[PDB]
A = this chain, B = another copy of it.
Amino acid sequence: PQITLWQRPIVTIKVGGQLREALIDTGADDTIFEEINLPGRWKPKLIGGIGGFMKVRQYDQIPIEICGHQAIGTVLVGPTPINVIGRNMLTQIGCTLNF
């Protein structure tokens, strides 16, 4: 779809068999979820944002459905205040900015 920005651009996700909502976030390189339970191996990773850094688990090659569109990629798990879909996934679903 087209999404305007009068409200936070939140969409419905399916990831690791679980349903979540997440913010379409063009300012995020990476995709990060709080409180999902993903299978298999992971590596610790530190991420930097406003306010400092955060420790996350990095999972690779994770399938995700983003507003009905399929992608696969890295998903970070850690204490984000809101789940975010970043550019690593947005490029796969053909998401663009327009003005």
Q: Which residues of A contact B (CB under 8 A)?
A: 1-6, 8-9, 23-29, 32, 47-54, 67, 69, 80-82, 84, 87, 90-91, 93-99
Contacts and interface: CB of A to CB of B under 8 A. Distances in A.
B48 A3 contact: no
Contacts of A90: 5, 99
Nearest to A81: B48
Nearest to A49: B50
B91 A99 contact: no
Contact of A26 (B24, B81, B94): B24
Contacts of A47: 50-51
A28 to B, nearest CB: 6
